[PDB]
C-alpha cells in the first residue's frame, strides 16, 4: 500500500534545511541532461525557509546551472504584490534571482485591489494555467486510459489543520478531480483558513502524477492530518489521504510535535 519517507527534525532551521537538501538530492540524482526538473511550489513559512536556503547556499545551480523550472501548486486571487500572494513570497525570497524563461507565476493580472475575485476569475486563471502547463511538461495518461496530465518533477506541499493541502479544501469540488479531465481547479478556503479568497490549485489527478511529493508539515494540531493519511484504513478522512495514491515518490518532512 502506501509506503512515504518520514523524516523528523526538532527546529525549523531543520526542516527547512531538510526540504531544500532533499531538493538538492533530486536535481542532483536526475543528473544535468534531465534540467531544469520542473516544480510546482508552496506557500507558506516553512516552505519560505526552505526557498530562502536554495537562495542564499544553492543560487549558482539554479541560476548558472538552471536546474530548475520553477511554477506553482496553488495561488491566492490577488494582485502578484500582494502580500496574500504565494508567488509573492517565493520572489521576494528566491525567484527575484531566477531568469524570468525559468519562472511561471499564475496569471492574476485581472485581478486589481478594486474588486474581489469570484470562482469565475480563478476558473478562467486555472484554464490558462492549465494551458501552459501542457506545452511545457509531459503528459502522462491517468491509468494507461485517462486524459492527459501534466508530470511535475516535483511538488511541494503544505497541510491545514483542517486536513487541506495546496488549495484543495474539504467538500470541494477540486478535491473530486481525480480523474485528470480537470489539471488546475479551484477553491475557497474553509472556516478556519485564511485568507478569504479565491484560490486556484493543481487538482488531485494532477499532483498524483507528479515524479516526487514533499510533504512539509509542523505544528501538533496538524498531527491528525498525518495520522488520517498514513491511517490503514480511511474513517473520518482528511482531504489529503488522497495522496496515498500518488504514483511518485511521497516524503513527510516533520517537525517534533506533529510527529509523535
Ligand atoms: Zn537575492
Given at each position: 500500500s502506501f509506503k512515504p519517507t518520514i523524516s523528523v527534525h526538532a527546529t525549523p532551521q531543520e526542516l527547512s534545511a531538510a526540504g531544500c537538501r532533499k531538493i538538492v538530492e533530486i536535481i542532483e540524482a536526475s543528473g544535468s541532461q534531465q534540467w531544469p526538473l520542473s516544480i510546482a511550489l508552496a506557500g507558506g513559512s516553512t516552505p519560505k525557509m526552505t526557498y530562502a536556503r536554495l537562495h542564499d547556499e544553492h543560487l549558482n545551480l539554479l541560476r548558472e546551472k538552471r536546474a530548475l523550472r520553477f511554477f506553482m501548486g496553488d495561488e491566492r486571487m490577488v494582485p502578484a504584490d500582494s502580500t496574500d500572494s504565494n508567488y509573492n513570497m517565493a520572489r521576494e525570497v528566491l525567484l527575484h534571482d531566477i531568469p524570468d524563461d525559468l519562472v511561471f507565476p499564475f496569471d492574476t493580472s485581472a485581478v486589481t485591489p478594486s474588486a474581489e475575485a469570484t470562482s469565475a476569475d480563478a476558473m478562467r486563471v486555472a484554464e490558462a494555467y492549465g494551458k501552459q502547463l501542457a506545452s511545457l511538461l509531459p503528459l502522462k495518461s491517468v491509468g494507461e486510459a485517462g486524459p492527459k496530465v501534466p508530470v511535475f518533477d516535483v511538488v511541494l506541499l503544505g497541510l491545514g489543520?483542517?486536513?487541506?493541502?495546496?488549495?484543495?479544501?474539504?467538500?470541494?469540488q477540486a478535491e473530486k478531480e481525480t480523474d485528470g479531465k480537470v489539471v488546475v481547479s479551484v477553491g475557497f478556503p474553509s472556516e478556519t483558513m485564511k485568507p478569504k479568497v479565491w484560490r486556484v490549485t493543481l487538482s488531485p489527478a494532477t499532483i498524483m502524477q507528479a515524479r516526487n511529493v514533499i510533504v512539509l508539515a509542523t505544528g501538533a494540531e496538524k498531527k491528525w492530518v498525518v495520522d488520517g493519511i498514513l491511517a490503514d484504513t480511511a474513517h473520518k478522512?482528511?482531504?489529503?489521504?488522497?495522496?496515498?495514491?500518488?504514483?511518485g515518490n511521497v516524503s513527510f518532512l516533520l517537525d517534533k510535535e506533529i510527529a509523535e
Open positions: 489543520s483542517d486536513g487541506h493541502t495546496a488549495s484543495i479544501f474539504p467538500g470541494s478522512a482528511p482531504v489529503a489521504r488522497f495522496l496515498r495514491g500518488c504514483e
